Amino acid sequence: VAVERVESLAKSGIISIPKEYIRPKEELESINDVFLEEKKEDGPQVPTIDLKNIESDDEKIRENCIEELKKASLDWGVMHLINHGIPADLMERVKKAGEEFFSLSVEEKEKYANDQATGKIQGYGSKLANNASGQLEWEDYFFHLAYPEEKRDLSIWPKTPSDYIEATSEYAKCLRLLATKVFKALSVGLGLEPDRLEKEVGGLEELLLQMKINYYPKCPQPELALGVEAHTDVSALTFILHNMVPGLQLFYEGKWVTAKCVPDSIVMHIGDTLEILSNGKYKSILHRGLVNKEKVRISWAVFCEPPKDKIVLKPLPEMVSVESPAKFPPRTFAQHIEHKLFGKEQ
Numbered sequence: 001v002a003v004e005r006v007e008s009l010a011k012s013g014i015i016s017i018p019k020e021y022i023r024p025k026e027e028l029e030s031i032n033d034v035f036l037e038e039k040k041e042d043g044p045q046v047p048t049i050d051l052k053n054i055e056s057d058d059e060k061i062r063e064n065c066i067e068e069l070k071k072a073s074l075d076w077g078v079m080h081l082i083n084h085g086i087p088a089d090l091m092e093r094v095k096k097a098g099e100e101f102f103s104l105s106v107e108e109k110e111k112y113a114n115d116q117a118t119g120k121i122q123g124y125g126s127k128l129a130n131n132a133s134g135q136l137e138w139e140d141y142f143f144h145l146a147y148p149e150e151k152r153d154l155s156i157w158p159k160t161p162s163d164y165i166e167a168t169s170e171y172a173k174c175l176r177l178l179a180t181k182v183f184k185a186l187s188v189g190l191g192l193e194p195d196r197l198e199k200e201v202g203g204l205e206e207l208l209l210q211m212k213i214n215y216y217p218k219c220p221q222p223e224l225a226l227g228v229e230a231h232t233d234v235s236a237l238t239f240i241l242h243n244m245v246p247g248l249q250l251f252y253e254g255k256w257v258t259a260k261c262v263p264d265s266i267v268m269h270i271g272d273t274l275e276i277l278s279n280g281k282y283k284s285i286l287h288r289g290l291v292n293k294e295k296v297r298i299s300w301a302v303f304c305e306p307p308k309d310k311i312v313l314k315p316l317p318e319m320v321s322v323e324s325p326a327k328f329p330p331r332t333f334a335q336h337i338e339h340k341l342f343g344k345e346q
């Protein structure tokens with residue numbers, strides 16, 4: 001098998017991108033210049049949610065916060081979080097370390113190569129074609145479990161920069177706390193006990209935090225490819241950071257909306273797991289990522305996922321009734337993932 005990283009292809013001197021990276025004709029019609037799209041202020045915009053009062057002593061103020069979070073989650077399912085409690089310097093340190101790792105040569109990064117054929121999903125890699133089309137996305141990545149700490153395999157984490165492990169682990173611990181805060185607010189939003197949603201996804205002992213650094217090299221024909229294909233996250237919640245280079249787009253009301261870069265914010269997605277549990281109330285929105293020819297884009301996505309086999313995911317009983325039938329049948333996390341593949345594969 002040949003191993004070709006997009007970064008390599010991006011520096012091979014090609015004037016035109018390979019066929020496998022060009023999207024089908026129908027999809028190309030919706031892809032425009034990300035910088036032009038970013039400028040547009042017409043149409044629905046991704047909501048910005050202020051979490052400053054999420055756990056305020058002032059009941060009225062707190063409920064307002066929770067209500068805003070609930071409304072955005074029920075409508076968009078995606079939002080820019082601000083005053084989320086994660087120190088700005090910590091986020092800056094995480095992004096710096098990520099940029100430094102990817103600044104290494106492809107050859108250096110290959111020392112961390114994952115190996116899907118043997119189940120070693122962690123490490124440096126790129127999406128392998130998984131269906132008849134053979135479609136590929138303009139992206140390279142680094143993937144690894146980040147929390148709980150006892151489940152980590154630190155031996156595969158980048159040794160360059162020297163503080164990768166320190167900054168990343170600190171960031172993971174902080175995100176785990178924020179996740180608990182969001183889960184409680186979302187639980188209350190559904191009229192459930194505060195601790196319900198987090199418990200349903202595994203709690204502190206089984207909920208996993210996976211870190212995926214997405215590297216999008218400059219692309220010569222940016223409008224013919226995608227950094228990330230259109231899809232929904234299967235996680236319960238996803239928290240994302242990026243290097244202030246636009247690219248994220250959301251499929252809202254049948255149109256592709258471009259997310260604007262909000263300083264010090266953290267993008268948060270409601271994932272399939274919460275959408276299933278809430279019986280469709282909280283939305284796991286379809287989204288994709290655009291690349292460009294001017295700047296390298298990098299994003300840091302941490303997926304908060306339930307154990308893959310231990311929990312059967314289905315709408316919670318409180319969310320189902322004769323008038324509100326189940327919008328999803330029961331499936332474990334692993335079975336849901338396979339079912340979505342089965343859909344595209346077929």
Ligand SMILES: O=C(O)CCC(=O)C(=O)O
Nearest residue numbers: 212214228248289299301
């Ligand atoms: O680059 C981004 O903004 C997010 C990438 C993404 O969709 C993912 O990691 O699932």
